[PDB]
Symmetry: C2
C-alpha cells in the first residue's frame, strides 16, 4: 500500500546505494589491457541487490535518519562488500569446470569475454576486495572486526563455499531432504542471514536477543528464498526441491514456509515496529 516515512526513506537509500555502486571506481595502474575494467564488470552488470537491501533494511530501521546520513557512505561500503562476495561466487560458479555459462543476465561472463584465468583471478580479487572494503569503512574498530568475523565465517568454508562445493559435486545426484536442506542452508541462507545480522552489528545497538532472532530469521527466509528460486527455474536436473518434492508439493511448501516466515516476523511488531515494517515490505516484494 502507501509507504510511511521510514519505509520511504529506506526505499530511497536502496536507490542511492545502487548509484554508489555504479560510481565505485578502482584505479589500477598497470600495463594489463583489461584487468581494471574486468574487475568490477560483473558487479555492475549483476544486480537485484537482495543482500545489500537486507543489510539496509535492518540498518535504516535501527539508526535515526540524521545519524545515518553521517555515515551513509561507510554503510554503503559495507553493503558493497556483501555484494562483492556474492558476485565472486557467481564468477566462479560460471566457470567451465563448474556451470560452464557463457552468459549471465544475457551479458558475457568473464571467461567467455576474456579468458578462464582472468575469471578465476577476478573472482579471487573480489573475494579479497570484500574484506578491504569492510576494513576501510570508517566505523568503530570493534564494529569492523565483528562485521569481518561474520562475513568471513558465513561466506567461507563453513558456509557459502561448503554449500557451493556440495552443489557442484552432487550436480546429477538425487539428495534426501536433510542433505538438500543442508546444501541450501549453506549455499544460499548463510550469506542472507549474515546480511541481516551485519545490519544489527553496523547499527551499533547491542541486543543479544535480536541478534539470535535475526540470525534464525535469515536462515529460514533464505530457505524460503531458495525454494521459491527452485520453483521459478521450472516455470521459465539441478539439486532442487521441485525434484525432491515435485512441483505441486514444492509450491505448497513455499506457501507454508511463507506463512511461517511472515508469522514469526509479526512477533517483531511490539518491540521493533520500524524493523518489522522494512523487513515485511522487502519480503512481500520477494513473494510477489
Amino acid at each position: 500500500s502507501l509507504s510511511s516515512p521510514n519505509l520511504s526513506f529506506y526505499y530511497n537509500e536502496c536507490e542511492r546505494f545502487e548509484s554508489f555502486l555504479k560510481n565505485h571506481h578502482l584505479h589500477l595502474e598497470s600495463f594489463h589491457p583489461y584487468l581494471e575494467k574486468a574487475f568490477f564488470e560483473m558487479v555492475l552488470n549483476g544486480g537485484k541487490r537482495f543482500r545489500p537491501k537486507l543489510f539496509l533494511a535492518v540498518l535504516c530501521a535501527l539508526v535515526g535518519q540524521k545519524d545515518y546520513s553521517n555515515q551513509q557512505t561507510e554503510y554503503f561500503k559495507i553493503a558493497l562488500s556483501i555484494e562483492c562476495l556474492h558476485t565472486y561466487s557467481l564468477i566462479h560458479d560460471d566457470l567451465p569446470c563448474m556451470d560452464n555459462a557463457a552468459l549471465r543476465r544475457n551479458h558475457p561472463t568473464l571467461h567467455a569475454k576474456y579468458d578462464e584465468t582472468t575469471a578465476v583471478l577476478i573472482g579471487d580479487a573480489l573475494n579479497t576486495y570484500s574484506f578491504e572494503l569492510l576494513s576501510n569503512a570508517l566505523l568503530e574498530s570493534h564494529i569492523i572486526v565483528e562485521l569481518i568475523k561474520i562475513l568471513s565465517a558465513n561466506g567461507g568454508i563453513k558456509g557459502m563455499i561448503l554449500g557451493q562445493a556440495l552443489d557442484c559435486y552432487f550436480e546429477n545426484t538425487p539428495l534426501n531432504l536433510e542433505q538438500l536442506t543442508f546444501l541450501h542452508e549453506h549455499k544460499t541462507a548463510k550469506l542472507i542471514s549474515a546480511s541481516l545480522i551485519m545490519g544489527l552489528v553496523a547499527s551499533g545497538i547491542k541486543d543479544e536477543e535480536l541478534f539470535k532472532w535475526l540470525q534464525a530469521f535469515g536462515l529460514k527466509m533464505g530457505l524460503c528464498f531458495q525454494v521459491l528460486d527452485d520453483i521459478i527455474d521450472v516455470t521459465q536436473a539441478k539439486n532442487s526441491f521441485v525434484n525432491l518434492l515435485g512441483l505441486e508439493r514444492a509450491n505448497n511448501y513455499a506457501q507454508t514456509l511463507k506463512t511461517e516466515v511472515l508469522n514469526d516476523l509479526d512477533a517483531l511488531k511490539p518491540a521493533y515496529p520500524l524493523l518489522q515494517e522494512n523487513l515485511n515490505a522487502l519480503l512481500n516484494t520477494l513473494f510477489k
Copy 2:
C-alpha cells in the same frame, strides 16, 4: 652462530609456529566425500614458512619476550593467516588453466588428487579463511583492522593478483626488464613486504619511519628472492634468466643480495634486535 637471547628466542618461536600450524584443525562435517580432508592439506604439506618467519622476526625483536608470551597464540593466528593466503595463491597457480602442475613440492596438487572444482573452491576458502583467522585474533581491535587493510590491499587486485594476472596474460610475450620487475614486485614482493609491516603493526608500537623502511625493504628483498628463485629453477617463460642469461642474472642476484644486506646494516644503530633477526633469516635464505 652463538645465538643471543633474542635470536635464540626467535628461532624457538619459529619452531613453535610450525607446531601450532600442524595442530591447527577446523571441524567441517558434511556429506561431501573429501572436502574436509582437502581444506588444510596444502597448508600442512607447504614449504618453508618464509612469510610467517619474516612476520615473527619483526614481532619477536620489537616486543618484550614476556609481553609476547601472553599473546603468542594470537600472534600465531596472524602468522597463519599470511600462510593461508600464500597457500591459496599456489593452489590457484597450479590449476590446468594456469600452470597445470601435478605436484607442489613433493605432494600431489588438489586438482590431481581430487578434482579441478575442489581445487578452485578450496583456494577460495583459504583466501576467505585468512580473514577469518585475522579477525578472530585477540589483539586490540584497531590493530586487527590495520592488519586486514594491509593483508587485503597487498593480497588483492592492487597487489598479488595484478602480478599473477600479468604473469598469465603475458605468458606468450617477451617482457622487458622494467615490465618483468613490476610483475614480480606485485606477484611476489608485495606479500613479503606485507609480512614485515604486519609484524610492526601487530607489535603495537608506532614508528612511521620504520614502517616506510620495512615496506620498501620488503619490496627489495622480495625482488631478490625472485631472482634467486629463478636461478634455482634453471639449476635443478618470463624470467630474469631468460631475459639476462644465467651469467648476468647471477651477478645481478649477487649485487642485489649485497644491496639488501647493506641496507639492512643501517638498522644496526636504531634497531639492533630487529637487524639481528632479519639478518639471520636472510643469511639462511641466501645460503640454501
